[PDB]
From a paper:
In these experiments, bacterial proteins with different functions were investigated. Microcrystals of photoactive yellow protein (PYP), a blue-light photoreceptor from Halorhodospira halophila, were used to explore the capability of microsecond X-ray pulses. A nitrite-reducing enzyme, cytochrome c nitrite reductase (ccNiR) from Shewanella oneidensis, was exploited to investigate potential secondary radiation damage, caused by 90 µs pulses, at heme centers. Finally, a first TR-SSX experiment was performed on the photosensory core module (PCM) of a bacterial phytochrome from the nonphotosynthetic myxobacterium Stigmatella aurantiaca.
Phytochromes are red/far-red light receptor enzymes that were originally discovered in plants, with homologs in bacteria and fungi. BphPs share a typical domain architecture comprising three conserved domains (PAS–GAF–PHY) known as the photosensory core module (PCM) and a C-terminal effector domain with enzymatic activity, usually a histidine kinase (HisK). BphPs sense red/far-red light and display a reversible photocycle triggered by the Z-to-E isomerization of a central chromophore, biliverdin (BV). This isomerization results in the formation of distinct states called Pr and Pfr (red and far-red light-absorbing states, respectively). Most notable is the conformational change of a stretch of amino-acid residues called the sensory tongue that transitions from a β-strand in the Pr state to a an α-helical conformation in the Pfr state. S. aurantiaca harbors two BphPs, SaBphP1 and SaBphP2, that bind BV and share similar domain compositions. Full-length phytochromes are challenging to crystallize, but the PCM, lacking the effector domain, forms crystals that diffract to 2 Å resolution and beyond. In the Pr state, Phe460 is buried close to the hydrophobic environment of ring D, stabilizing the Pr state.
Author numbering:
A (entry chain B), B (entry chain A): 9 to 490
Write the structure that this text describes.
């Protein structure tokens, strides 16, 4: 339901955060086209007067002095009478956007940055699980930033999330282990955070600073702030932070292999600015964790295939030890079941269902089986909530919540089918998930939920999901039973 | 071990490098037990007059002031009359070793390392090969250190090596593509360089500074300088470097999944000293490269298994369909050879052999078959130098330099054998690999070779090696064939 939450144009809200100043210039003269309403505090003149002027008549010589590395390298530290500032240049809507926010003052920031970086490479990580991997990343972002709480947030396949790891001050409330609606981060935001992987909300109570004029005159809409570091966020989201007790918020996108794996979310009870130089040091940590997780995941899946393939080879040696169909399956029952991590297996080598292990009754097999041939799957069909797909068996989640069947013949319907029983899982949603928002009457005004306390839910009638190794093992068993 | 090369106790040579000072204290009084002979250059008093004195009376006040963080963190910057120094503590032979070394002078050093760390962690690495991954490792290590030439050196299975990548300042000889004998880095060095990942030789012309006494009086041998940043290196190597025309040398160990994969080797035409803190920055880069290589490599091998398994998946459909064995083993011939990257396959499934593709003649295969049935292998056997283990086919490197064989039956001689042809290769050694050293008459003193000029060698009668995927595919195919 592409609803109110997904429709807000969070890049065209036309305001910025108060700790910074934004200028935008057009054309060969670099004439001031747009300017934030608070620019007097740095430029010494009312912003209204500066509109339309050449850039040499607007910026101080300090900033203009560093224009070329600004343009080349994208950012420079300038020292102005007001103090040390970071200047950030990008292009948006055919304008040259210039943003100025307070520079990093801690001289040894990069030295400490390099030290935590060492902690996230080390010899080997994940040494007691990729769990210890996330906990290090959480602890190092928190060491580097000073945020009262830091959490590693992963997306599920339906874009809801759970906090997997957490590093926070003593006496802080936590969120470790809970799940959050997919609508807490709607579709257009995930889209943006796939492009722009950083965001600081320095003070969740502050007023947003408007831009002048409110529309880019040639465009008829406000300036696109997709890449702005000062961009003020959805007012819906500010209300969510305050409903949470949060005063400052800083988050970074974990992009694993081009996709949006999750987030590193940081909370501070009080307003808190983090310099751009230091936000970029944190970005290095998140790219490093994304690298550590790919290499451990790929190593785990290799070890998985190695175990399955040893099983397959032990099955081959068995069959190659005497003309003996239904009996070697009987004699190698665990290996046929562990092939795909199953609890039973129906083998339709044609005649009668040969039922091994923990299986439904014979009739129920054939009925499941008749129904299977009429499906548009090539060599294999798999599911974890069978009963959703076939309620003739919805009451047998004791033995067949999930199934994995490979077609043993092209035409005709010989099958091997592995069965899995349900595993009940309790999950703690952070708030009642049936009511994730609060609409006013008329439904044109949405609000975040008011509560986040654990709202608990047990899931039934779904099995453990069929992993990639289970599928590959199934393909191989089919390879040797033809 | 073989050569006298392997016998040199390079950790007990008894000297340090002249740009630093080493001091070793024993026992609760921190009495001075061992000190380098140049220690007056930083302490005022004659070193021998200091042996047997408490630490409090021998060290300058500047060093003593920093004593507690030095004991805690194990490294510390102190400002001495002779300049800024880095102080390091380690333990060796029941003594507390203190080494002094000139410190880093560029205050923006770590900001520079943090930027190049971004270059190397950057997602979408290797998107023009692991080869472009290595080139970036050389280029950034060269950027961070300023050496005239930085090379990337990979060890082969016999521990000879080749330079896979190279970054060097313009107008300088290179070594890209060349190979170097295993004896160039002898066995005790490879062992030491596994557990000690850095070495700096700052001045290849300099004489070492001796320790006093020449032995630890308790032990009757020199102080173990294994973990010493100032250790003076084997004179045979110092001669090697001078023969190479190198004035300073610095190298780092590439450790990948715990074993010594190779080195990043740095040469300077002139003496040059890298700070400890800058050396530790380069170490960050190498653990990065190691990590980038593991994820890329396990990515490649998983992509490979995927193609093999798709071949296997399509073989299984060809079976379980029309006809006999040899029938389908004739349309799918291209897949059967492809399974293992091979130009031929012989199939012994009962009658005469089934020869598919480019194979040696039926009598030769029958002769090879009977010899295979008497060898200590369980299901698979493979080689890439068939002729040097089976001379009957040494002449047939045109069709059978490599074989890969699987048993399709236990106590029986049922086999699938894949053949490969020779693939000739032109190695360029850095000098004559038959004379990799110039020994003196009576063979008591060795010297490195005099020349490193390109020296060609062609390797015949060897096939392309059998990779994990090849082996994996073969076993899976045996799975299919009862
Ligand atoms: C650990 C748990 C946790 C979650 C799940 C979380 C959600 C979350 N919501 C966000 C933004 C957002 N949330 C919303 C909208 C909504 N949000 C709602 O709950 C409903 C009511 C709507 C809409 C009807 C929008 C539009 C943004 C984008 C803010 C912006 O970039 O403008 C962000 C990015 C901004 C930031 O880092 O603070 C996060 C991390 N924050 C956390 O700490
Ligand atoms: C371009 C490729 C390339 C190679 C292959 C190379 C070899 C090499 N030899 C080394 C050490 C060494 N080499 C030797 C010994 C020998 N060496 C000989 O050729 C024979 C004569 C002996 C002995 C019989 C020893 C003993 C060491 C250990 C040095 C030490 O740490 O004390 C080292 C480590 C120290 C350093 O980085 O300088 C390298 C890199 N250097 C390069 O740049």
């Amino acid at each position: 339901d592409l609803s109110q939450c997904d429709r807000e144009p969070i890049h065209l809200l036309g305001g910025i955060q108060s700790h910074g100043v934004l200028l935008a210039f057009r054309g060969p003269d670099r004439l001031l086209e747009v300017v934030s309403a608070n620019a007097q505090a740095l430029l010494g003149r009312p912003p209204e007067t500066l509109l339309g002027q050449p850039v040499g008549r607007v910026l101080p010589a300090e900033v203009l002095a560093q224009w070329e590395p600004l343009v080349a390298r994208g950012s420079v530290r300038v020292v102005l009478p007001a103090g040390a500032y970071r200047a950030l240049l990008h292009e948006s809507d055919g304008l040259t956007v210039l943003e100025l926010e307070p520079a990093e003052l801690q001289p040894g920031m990069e030295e400490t940055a390099l030290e935590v970086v060492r902690r996230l490479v080390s010899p080997l990580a994940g040494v007691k699980g990729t769990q210890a991997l996330l906990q290090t990343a959480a602890d190092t972002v928190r060491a580097l930033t000073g945020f009262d709480r830091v959490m590693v947030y992963r997306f599920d396949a339906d874009w809801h999330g759970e906090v997997l790891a957490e590093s926070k001050r003593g006496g802080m409330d936590g969120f470790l282990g809970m799940h959050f609606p997919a609508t807490d981060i709607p579709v257009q935001a995930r889209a943006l955070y796939t492009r722009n992987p950083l965001r600081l909300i320095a003070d969740a109570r502050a007023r947003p600073v408007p831009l002048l004029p409110p529309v880019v005159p040639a465009l008829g809409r406000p300036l696109d702030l997709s890449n702005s570091a000062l961009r003020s966020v959805s007012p819906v989201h500010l209300e969510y932070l305050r409903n949470m007790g949060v005063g400052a918020s800083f988050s970074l996108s974990l992009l694993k292999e081009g996709v949006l794996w999750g987030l590193i979310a940081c909370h501070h009870l009080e307003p808190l600015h983090i310099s751009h130089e230091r936000r970029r040091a944190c970005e290095v940590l998140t790219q490093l964790l994304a690298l550590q997780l790919s290499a451990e995941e790929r190593a785990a899946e290799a070890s998985e295939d190695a175990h399955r393939a040893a099983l397959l080879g032990q099955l081959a040696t068995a069959m190659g030890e005497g003309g003996t169909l239904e009996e070697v399956l009987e004699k190698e029952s665990e290996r046929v079941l562990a092939l795909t991590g199953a609890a039973g297996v129906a083998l339709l080598l044609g005649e009668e269902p040969l039922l091994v292990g923990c299986t439904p009754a014979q009739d129920e097999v054939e009925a499941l089986v008749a129904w299977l041939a009429t499906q548009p799957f090539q060599t294999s069909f798999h599911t974890d909530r069978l009963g959703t797909v076939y309620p003739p068996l919805a009451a047998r989640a004791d033995v067949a919540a999930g199934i994995l069947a490979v077609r043993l013949a092209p035409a005709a319907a010989r099958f091997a089918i592995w069965f899995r029983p349900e595993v009940a899982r309790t999950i703690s949603w952070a708030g009642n998930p049936r009511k994730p928002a609060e609409p006013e009457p008329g439904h044109q005004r949405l609000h975040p939920r008011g509560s986040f306390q654990a709202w608990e839910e047990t899931v039934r009638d779904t099995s453990l999901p069929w992993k990639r190794a289970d599928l590959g093992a199934a393909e191989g068993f089919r390879g040797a039973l033809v």
